[PDB]
Structures are given as structure tokens and as C-alpha cells.
Design a protein around this ligand. Sequence first.
Ligand SMILES: Nc1ncnc2c1ncn2[C@@H]1O[C@H](CSCC[C@H](N)C(=O)O)[C@@H](O)[C@H]1O
Length: 245
Amino acid sequence: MKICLIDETGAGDGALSVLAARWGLEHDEDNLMALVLTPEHLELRKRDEPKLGGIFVDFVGGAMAHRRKFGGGRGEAVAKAVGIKGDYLPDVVDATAGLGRDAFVLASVGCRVRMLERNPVVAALLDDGLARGYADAEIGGWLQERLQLIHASSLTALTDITPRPQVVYLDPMFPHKQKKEMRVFQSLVGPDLDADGLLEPARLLATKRVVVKRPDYAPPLANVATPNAVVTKGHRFDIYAGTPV
Ligand SMILES: Nc1ncnc2c1ncn2[C@@H]1O[C@H](CSCC[C@H](N)C(=O)O)[C@@H](O)[C@H]1O
């Protein structure tokens, strides 16, 4: 995948070159997007709009830490959609990791989560955040145990997932027509054209449920209607049945 690779570490140890090789990234000097390795973290920038700043995955601070403390945890809309209740903490597979925001919430409540991400740049950003997260003296311990990243496509990797999770969470990038962070991220990640193909394999893998995030008025994934869903402001979480063992 092409992208402008920028080194702002001053180390000269080849960290960026190793990272590009590992994720199969190709340097593109005139690319609209830039992946920058800084002394603090790996971030993504929209070169034509510096005012938007850079975005990076941070499980320890910022917005994720604020949501963990004030979001409600088991009380979150996504947590109730996955079925979290009482001492029931299902194993979850987030087939569309992205920035890992929803994944982190579920793992923070107590769920064991496996994240899948096929975009090499996104995966690189998540892996850097995970490295910093695992290193945290406070959450590093449980984070490493309840949140793992898998670089693969859920369209074909979901089938052979073992052990089978009770729930599969789906939030592919929808073709939005209607903040800074989102503008930068969406400039990289366009609509996932083959998203409708995730429902079938997801319902076969999950033993209990499949949750699909959908914005208001957006059609259900794969046009498969469902009577169950958690509704919040702006979006809803469609709930489907899985395939019991
Ligand atoms: N088959 C697939 N396998 C892995 N990742 C996939 C995928 N189809 C789409 N994706 C990823 O799914 C992500 C959805 S973006 C949503 C991010 C997430 N809801 C959050 O909490 O932030 C995108 O980054 C896209 O690259």
C-alpha cells in the first residue's frame, strides 16, 4: 500500500524501514496521506490539511481513557448490544478493528477480544498503539490478555477462527454522504465496498450473536432485516443470531 513515509525520530536505526517491510508499505513521496514515526508514536496525517493535525491510537490517554472512565463500560450501547450482562463476558471478534475504539471498550469491561484489520496502514497504527498499551504499567497487564490484533481479512479469515467467539462485531466503513480525527481517518479509509459480504461468515462463526453498527437510516448489512437492535443518538446496533454449537 502506497503512502508517504516520514521519519521524525532522529534515530537512524531503520525502525521506519522495518515497519514498512513488516506491513508491506510502499513509500509514495507525493501521496496525499503520510505515516509519520515520531519519538512519541506512529501517526497518520492529511498532508494538504495540517490544521487537522495527526491521528494515532492511544489506549492509555486522550479520548480512549476518558471514554473508559466516563463512557459507562457495561452500560455502553455497544456493550449492551454484544449481550454483556451480569457476569456474562463473551469472547468477541471485532472483524473490522479500525481505530479499535469499540474493541477497547469491550476489552475494558472484561471481554476477551480479537481484532481483525486488513488495511496495512490502519494495522500499523493499531500495532503501535498496542505496543504502547501493553507497556503501560496500569492497563498493560490485562490489555495484553484481553486485546489482540490479527492482520487479516474477515471476509476469508473468519471461517477458521478458533476458538469460536460468542459474538462477532461488525462496523465496516459505510458510504457516508452527510471532527478532525474522523476527517483524517476517512481520508485514508474509504467505503468498504465488499462489506455486505461480512454478515454471512460472521453469523456462522459466532455461537451467540452478531452485532452490526449502522448509522441512522442506513440499510441493514446485506439487506438482511432484523427486529433486534440497540438504538442510540446517530446510530444503531443491529443484532442477529449466531450459529449455536
Ligand atoms: N474483512 C475485513 N477484515 C479486516 N478489517 C476489515 C475488513 N473489512 C473492513 N475492515 C476494516 O474495518 C474498519 C472499520 S472502521 C470502524 C472502526 C471501529 N468501529 C472503531 O471503534 O473505531 C476499517 O479500518 C477497515 O479497514
